[PDB]
Amino acid sequence: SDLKDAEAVQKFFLEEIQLGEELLAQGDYEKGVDHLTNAIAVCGQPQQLLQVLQQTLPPPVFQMLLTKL
């Protein structure tokens, strides 16, 4: 890992979170969760992100997100 490698991961992470958030605002719960799942997948320790998402999403939506990992 150089700076390019981490930078591409940070950028993907940020794009997916943004898409996740927009799609959910539009009520496409399924695709929004897919995007959030991609952002979670690239974090070695997603606990804090998950706690923030639990505070931000409706419970059944957060639930769903947990089943996908």
Partner: peptide, 11 residues
């Protein structure tokens, strides 16, 4: 979209 990213940085 973006408020979620902002919220995540804050720490």
């Amino acid at each position: 979209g973006x408020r979620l990213c902002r919220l995540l940085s804050y720490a």
